[model samples]
Target: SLRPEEIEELREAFREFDKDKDGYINCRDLGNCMRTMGYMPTEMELIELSQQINMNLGGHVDFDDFVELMGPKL
Candidate 1:
């Protein structure tokens, strides 16, 4: 499980990746994020990643979705 600090760090990172401050991160945001992390995800990779975890079908990664996807590890 991730520690409290680790979870906080993750949350902060998520916020940073949500570049538009729109409370969600989409494919473009995620692509930039991946690049920042040294992993340039292709468009297909982004699509797959979104489809694999996007419960909202809003074509974006929301905070709730993010928490659900990541909380298990913490």
Candidate 2:
């Protein structure tokens, strides 16, 4: 399980990435997030990771989805 501080950090990070304020991080914005973090994955790589997370390429990934991807598994 994540500590409270870690969870809060993730929440803040999510806010930063959810640029449109639509409560999700769309594929396009995710690229921005990666760039901001200084990691540039290829488009195909992003698509593959999104697919692994069950994110719709044409849609967005919610905060819960982000957590699932970044958080520790139970």
Candidate 3:
């Protein structure tokens, strides 16, 4: 499980990619989140993972979804 600091760190990094500042990160670019977590994910991994979570690579993804996808990896 993520500690308090790690949890907040994830949010802080997610905010960096939440370009519109509308609380939703662009699903297509979600790999940036992992990058911030010290993971240099490949482009193909990003696409597949985004699709698995949102069912649409072009959709907007909220932080909860981000948490769900990253909980294990983080």
| Number of the top lDDT candidate | 3
Put down candidate 1 lDDT per residue, 1-74, tens digits, no spaces: 54576457667878977768877776555555455543455778767876664545666776665555555341
Model 2 quality (TM-score)? 0.57
TM-score of 1: 0.52
Per-model lDDT: 0.61, 0.62, 0.68
lDDT of 2 by residue, 1-74 (tens): 45676667768888987667777775556555544543455788777865654545446677776665555423
Compared with the true structure, the alpha-carbon lDDT of candidate 1 equals: 0.61
lDDT of 3 at 40: 63
Per-residue lDDT of model 3, residues 1-74, tens digit only: 54666667778877877778877775656776677664666788777776766665346677877766677553
Clash counts for all predictions: 0, 0, 0
Deviating ranges (above 4 Å) for candidate 2:
31-47, 51-58
